[PDB]
Paper text:
Fluc channels, present in all classes of life except higher animals, allow passive transit of F- ions across the membrane down their electrochemical gradient. Bacterial Fluc channels are constructed as small, dual-topology dimers; the two subunits, each of ~120 residues, span the membrane in opposite orientations to form the functional complex. These channels are notable for this unusual architecture as well as for exceptionally high F-/Cl-selectivity. A Fluc homologue from an E. coli virulence plasmid, nicknamed ‘Ec2’, was used for all experiments.
The most conservative variant, Tyr, is particularly striking since it differs from Phe only by the presence of the ring hydroxyl. A crystal structure of the F80Y mutant, solved to assess F- binding and structure of the pore region, is essentially identical to WT (Cα rmsd ~0.3 Å) with the Tyr ring congruent to that of WT Phe. In contrast to previous structures of inactive Ile mutants, F- remains bound to the Tyr construct in precisely the same positions as in WT. Other than the added hydroxyl group, no significant structural changes between WT and the inactive F80Y mutant are apparent, nor does the structure suggest a clear reason why F- fails to permeate the mutant. The failure of even Tyr to functionally substitute for Phe at either Ec2 position is particularly surprising in light of the F80Y crystal structure. The Tyr and Phe rings and the F- ions adopt identical positions, and the Tyr hydroxyl points away from the bound F-, its presence leaving other parts of the protein undisturbed. Modification of ring electrostatics by the polarizable hydroxyl may lead to a more tightly bound ion, inhibiting flux. In the case of F80Y, favorable hydroxide-phenyl interactions with the neighboring F83 could also inhibit sidechain movement. Previous removal of the central phenylalanines (F80I, F83I) led to a loss of fluoride density in crystal structures, suggesting that the F83M and F80Y mutants inhibit transport via a mechanism fundamentally different from the simple loss of a binding site.
Residue numbers in the entry:
A (entry chain D), D (entry chain C): 1 to 96
B (entry chain A): 2 to 125
C (entry chain B): 1 to 125
């Protein structure tokens, strides 16, 4: 009954080559969040990196100016039934 | 074999109770899962009352003593789930609640055993 | 709910039976820190830790096997109630040094075994 | 297999009106020892008192000079199977 997916994923600050994102944590023990990002035109490899469970923001660097990016976030979390497992993702688009 | 039935019947009742209470309640407060706490506190209470009661009734069948302690209290309580909860909190950088979980489970479980023992001793 | 109930009972009965045999056989050897009750908690800590790391890497395995190993076996094998009466008895007997030692060894020991279980499998993978 | 009864109960020192007794502890968690004493001629009420589990001696006072006394010691102890229970006694006779 408790959701392990984050909510309110959004870009709070941007430069031409970077984005600062934030999200609301789900009501479960999150061990780490996984952030994925890639060019929305789908001939470009998607990259990922983790951030600790205590954090609810992340910086994405090394982007190209004036390009549409798709950014997703999911959790690796502890629950009673499933022990360590991965959540479904939450997703947004943003143009540098 | 008769002793083995006491362990299995009692143990199965305890494990089943722990399974129902944990899956129903643990998710309500993830920093200190309340299903796992309640089963340990409750098992502490039952073993404490058994401590005081069996002393006064030395001629009870060892079948009933075994079914209540090694069976029910053994199956109901858990140290392994207590550990993964704390381990997960430590991995998540949540040190304040990892410490709090350890103190509340230990201090809480001894307090419930004391209450079980002294309530029956005060009655008798 | 019935297939899940079998996993809990089969796993739980194996764990409780193991705890019963190991405790009655060994606890009396060292009464200040009963070794049967310690070994079952340390062993359950090891198994749950290895489960923690393994099931993460195999996310689509049957919930029957996960339930039988964790809530069943590890749940039935480990014990908090016996840990309490042992400590309570030591406190009533005025044996404070071993009451403290029993609490530290069970807690610190059980977390260490869970860490080993998790990191051994993570290091292999 | 492990005995909860004490061994080597004996009087280590005596005056006409008191006895100091000692015993070896059994290999179990003893919570308290119970000492009983009374006149061996059985028209005299037996008295008892406890001593902490850490102690293995006790003093008996207020005795009559030149009289045979029966002195017993048993334990209240923790074990895995029986939790708290009372042991069988160990017993000696001693004339003041
Ligand atoms: C019995 C001995 C007990 C004490 C042992 C303490 C060991 C702690 C350091 C081990 O090394 C860590 O290994 C993690 C991987 O296992 C890495 O986490 C990385 O990967 C994790 C997911 O695998 C994420 O949760 C983290 O946020 C991310 O930093 C982390 O960088 C690295 O330092
Ligand atoms: C009393 C005896 C107990 C013995 C058992 C000890 C517990 C062992 C679990 C260690 O887990 C580590 O926990 C770190 C956090 O606590 C994680 O750091 C992660 O999170 C940190 C911030 O919270 C970042 O600085 C790190 O880079 C990042 O890897 C790290 O990955 C993880 O492996
Ligand atoms: C930390 C978490 C919470 C812990 C739970 C609460 C503590 C447990 C109850 C302690 O029980 C008492 O312990 C005393 C001390 O062991 C005993 O005194 C006995 O021993 C004393 C010390 O030798 C003597 O002075 C007394 O006369 C003698 O009754 C007393 O009988 C017993 O009822
Ligand atoms: F454990
Ligand atoms: F916990
Ligand atoms: F308990
Ligand atoms: F203990
Ligand atoms: Na258990």
């Amino acid at each position: 009954s408790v959701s392990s997916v984050p909510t309110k994923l959004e870009v709070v600050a941007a430069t031409p080559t970077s984005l600062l994102i934030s999200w609301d944590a789900p009501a479960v023990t999150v061990v780490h969040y996984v952030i994925t990002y890639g060019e929305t035109g789908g001939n470009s490899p998607v990259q990922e990196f983790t951030v600790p469970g205590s954090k609810s923001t992340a910086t994405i660097s090394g982007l190209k100016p004036g390009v549409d990016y798709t950014i997703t976030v999911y959790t690796m979390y502890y629950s009673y039934s499933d022990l360590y497992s991965y959540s479904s993702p939450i997703s947004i688009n943003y143009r540098t | 074999i008769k002793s083995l039935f006491a362990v299995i019947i009692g143990g199965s009742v305890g494990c089943t109770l722990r399974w129902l209470l944990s899956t129903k309640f643990n998710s309500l407060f993830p920093n200190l899962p309340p299903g796992t706490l309640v089963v340990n506190l409750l098992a502490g209470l039952i073993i404490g009352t058994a401590l005081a009661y069996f002393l006064r009734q030395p001629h009870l069948d060892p079948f009933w003593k075994l079914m209540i302690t090694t069976g029910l209290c053994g199956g109901l309580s858990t140290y392994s789930t207590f550990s993964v909860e704390v381990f997960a909190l430590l991995q998540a950088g949540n040190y304040i609640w990892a410490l709090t979980s350890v103190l509340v489970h230990v201090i809480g479980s001894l307090i419930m055993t004391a209450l079980g023992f002294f309530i029956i001793t005060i009655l008798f």
